Amino acid sequence: VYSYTEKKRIRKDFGKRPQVLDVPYLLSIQLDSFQKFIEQDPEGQYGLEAAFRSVFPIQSYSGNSELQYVSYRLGEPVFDVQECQIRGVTYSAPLRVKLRLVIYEREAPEGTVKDIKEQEVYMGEIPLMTDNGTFVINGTERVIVSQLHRSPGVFFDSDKGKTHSSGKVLYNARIIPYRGSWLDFEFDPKDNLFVRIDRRRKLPATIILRALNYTTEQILDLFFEKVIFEIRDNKLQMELVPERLRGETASFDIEANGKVYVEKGRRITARHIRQLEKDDVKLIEVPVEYIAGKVVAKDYIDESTGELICAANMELSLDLLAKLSQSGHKRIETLFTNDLDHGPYISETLRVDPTNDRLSALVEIYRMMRPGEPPTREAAESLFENLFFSEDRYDLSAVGRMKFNRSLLREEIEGSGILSKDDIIDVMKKLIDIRNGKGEVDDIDHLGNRRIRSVGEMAENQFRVGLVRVERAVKERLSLGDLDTLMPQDMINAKPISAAVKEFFGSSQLSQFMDQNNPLSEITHKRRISALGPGGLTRERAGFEVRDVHPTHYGRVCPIETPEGPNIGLINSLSVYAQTNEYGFLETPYRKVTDGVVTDEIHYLSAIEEGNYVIAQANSNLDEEGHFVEDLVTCRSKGESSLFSRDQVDYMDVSTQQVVSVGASLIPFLEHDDANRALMGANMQRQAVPTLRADKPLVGTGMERAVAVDSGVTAVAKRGGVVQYVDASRIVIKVNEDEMYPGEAGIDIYNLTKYTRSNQNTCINQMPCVSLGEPVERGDVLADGPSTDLGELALGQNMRVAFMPWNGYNFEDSILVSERVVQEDRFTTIHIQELACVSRDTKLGPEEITADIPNVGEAALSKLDESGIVYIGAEVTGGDILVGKVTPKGETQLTPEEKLLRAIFGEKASDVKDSSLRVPNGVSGTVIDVQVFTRDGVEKDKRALEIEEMQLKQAKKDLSEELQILEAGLFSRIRAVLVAGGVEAEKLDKLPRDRWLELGLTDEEKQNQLEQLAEQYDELKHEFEKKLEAKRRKITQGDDLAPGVLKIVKVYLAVKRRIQPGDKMAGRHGNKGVISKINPIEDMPYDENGTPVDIVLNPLGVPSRMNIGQILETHLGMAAKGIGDKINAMLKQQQEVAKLREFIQRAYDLGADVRQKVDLSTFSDEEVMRLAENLRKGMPIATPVFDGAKEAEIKELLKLGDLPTSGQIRLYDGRTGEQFERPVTVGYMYMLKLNHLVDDKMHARSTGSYSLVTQQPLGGKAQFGGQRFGEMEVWALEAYGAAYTLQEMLTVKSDDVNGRTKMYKNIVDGNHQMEPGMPESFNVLLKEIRSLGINIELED
């Protein structure tokens, strides 16, 4: 039931809802996308195949030449991840595409070619993703963060009644493709349709209809319905449809067949319509004035002479009726207009349309798109055809086509990627329908309208950009006269494609530096959705509606975890169970509720399918078989939520965690925290520095193991077996017989990362958590990364905390810390820094790395060897020389007093300048690693030769002692095989080992297995040989340094930073704080047993901030530590194993109807003792996110120990011995050490380097820069009367060149007086204004 890695320390689960779906692989959003990118797909759908098939074949200008694509393959990377992180290059694989050049024969449409030439051409290198979803690009690990952008398709927004005085809603449509132009439609306050392309100047919407080869009669046929009048020899009777009369009031008598229906001044009521339908009236007699405003439909010309009586779209009148009366026309077609249901918008737009033909419309479009040049007919036609109807310059998508068809209620989901006439007509018709009153405007914040790009999609887009860049040159090259018997390699330049891919991966907004100070930081950086980037909104132009949390974020995007600041709501984080659709839309799992039972089958529903069903809640009780135990349950149907009967529900939530991300699901008692405090705690939990010793969370959630294993910090066993050898840097697992392939010798070797630096200069270190001769199984952890304890995530330490005010040392948010916390090195962290010393080639000569530095004594050069580089293990403080470098310089040209001094003392000058590398001031570490890189033309000093000898020895030793282990395992396998089927008890050890693999057996597959083992051993020997030669040739080879630099020396210092006042600590509930004092042990408040508290926190921070989760975490930590203390007392008295069994089972049987039955009676009396030894520092407790432990269970746990159920104890004062007048809340809370250390914040300056144009001090602490005394501080000094302080701020301290030297000399001469002068920035301003045409001057 329980795994061997989890029988060591079982966390007591207080959750009560049984889980149905286990948490998926967390980094599966980064790994699936790039897998789709670089994958041989037989259909040209995903990745490089799609790009190659969408660009190739490249055909010349009908020159009987064609370059066509065959296949591709990714080569082997030159260096693996570690080598390219050390050297400083990209981890990538060479892309090698196989092409084929074919030359046709003249006078043939598709005739037989005359020659073929199939060649494989190399085009660029594409970076490769590591096992964890990161990219090594220039030695640094980067993460390509996903993007949340608007899906392609047609979106019918509105105007909400603003932007106009009358308050009219101006409905608009917009067609957004993946690649192409924007075909926006809209309305003006006069209800005339308009169209604008690429957000340019506005044009009438009928211009595009005419440009699509439509007449006026055809347009009126499309967008209107006819009213057939007729000349029945008198009165102009018309055909009548009763539905046309709805919402009308006729001033006359509507009388048909001599029957009165609607009287004078009577509105045509619904009863009147029903009466007309019942009588089946299809023809009526209307007054002659009824056509006084009706718009005709078509062109009616004279029968006699052919003259134009009335053109299409012109309102008829009495004279026009007379002119069409005796002409010979009897059928008159008029448009159906109205004011409420069928508005005449197209007719009015036609009446505003300036053009009257297709060519006029095309010319007007050309003048709008490209103003200022004379338009040709063919140029305008080409522009219009290349706007939206060309496969190259326009592509909607597959997603765009699907959304386009869904929005227009079509039945097909696939089709052409370019627009057609039908698409534009349908968009216009639906916009007009929305204007009429039927139809709803879309919301652009719905998660059914927003889509997720990832690494594979964006990389494919950039690769396609590079491909079209190279196809331009290939098409130019084939048509350039030459025939030419050339190969398919002289036309392709690999620099455009590789340049595009390098531009994307290295210099992009979504390709950012990885956050590597936690497993949680990496995991939550890879699962990050960003609304910014290339193709999305900016931090300044973003409004309030994209920042808000939509009802469709439920289960797909975390509501709380988002950065607070300029981009809040733009950098959202993916939820726990959320997935991505086939098209890119977020979806979340729900389990189907059949007729009456909640089944276990799970369906993934996107944000549009979710609205149709009514989805129950995870906090719903089931009666052990599926039925809802209540008679009506609470569910959310369409955004809104209310109570529904149990016979109406369709789906149920999988879990209570599915609404929050993986960073906000690590906060115990989240439901008691305020949302602002929960946001702050989620955002601060990933700044925690990994300390010297990961402890564990004593009050956790159960999400710790998932975060620690699904990241890449631990070492997880690939196959089961028995640990054969453990070491500080290696674990060897002897795989089980049933998990081994028939050929190989089954042993797994795990090499551990030891003391490397992360991106944030912290320390990365894996230490084994298994012991020698210990069974492991698949999935068990073998080593713990940074912030991991036995496979669980452990961000900080849990310490005894009292909530009381203590003499003002925890005043606002400050923290009072005991001295035991700093004595025990609980918050001591190791920081590793890289320092480089580049030796370049100057004009006066090269720079050397000699240890013979001028002007320094023998005391400073004591830590340097003969080669001028510091020793390994040397403890260097600030100012100590690490690498001694001297640069040549010219002639000093010293002053008369200086040369008199030289003449008196006879000490000649030095021609070289001391430019040595030295430790930065303030830091004090130990040199743990020195790396020397040398250009391949320069002699190597003795230190580089020693480093090379060490590296070659280590490479040979590692390969030798991996081959020894593999050979030993293979021979043990052979010996075990020889025991059965040809048994040899002691007839085996006399002959040499090499003869064990060439012995015969029966005519079965056992001889084939012995021979397979022998072949494997021979392959291992030759593999060792070839790997050794490769390693030697790779170690001895030179380096590809930058142009100019001769050699680089890098020194790594490890600094152990203890805790101190000013360091920022926090908890998981948004309770940050800067510690203020390190109190002695005897000054801390202590309870009845003399045990002092470790941290004293202010009780005043709790009521105003409503983060009540920390109080309950304190009480539950106290209960857990009480159980641990009881177990520890039973273990110190070495009572018995039955007593331990009884108490641990009683502790695991709490509380009220929980899951996680443990059944401690199946343990083996030695697994009980390991468990009890792991539970003697406190029993870990799992409190799920919204399931949790009720406070009654906390009281029961407190009773189970011997603690008071109040959670508060009588506390004494360490300095006076007098008890505090009230009981105070003592307990254990899990504290974190955020990465805001005070020795990285403190800065001070008096005089340093000044800037170049404006002679002012530089920026802070990187170049020893001053503090900006900005405009608001100037206002503050003007609000006082401080006129002299201000004047020295802006003249002598900053900018006046003569005055600052004079002031320095005055200060060192004991005179405090200023001679201000005028700043240099004002002179710069005068020169810059004067270098315009303007003459500004100072006059007196």
Partner: peptide
């Protein structure tokens, strides 16, 4: 066409 655009290359082409 005079004068719609600034575009000193378009004016040269014109």
């Amino acid at each position: 066409e005079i004068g719609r655009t600034t575009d000193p290359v378009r004016m040269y082409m014109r």
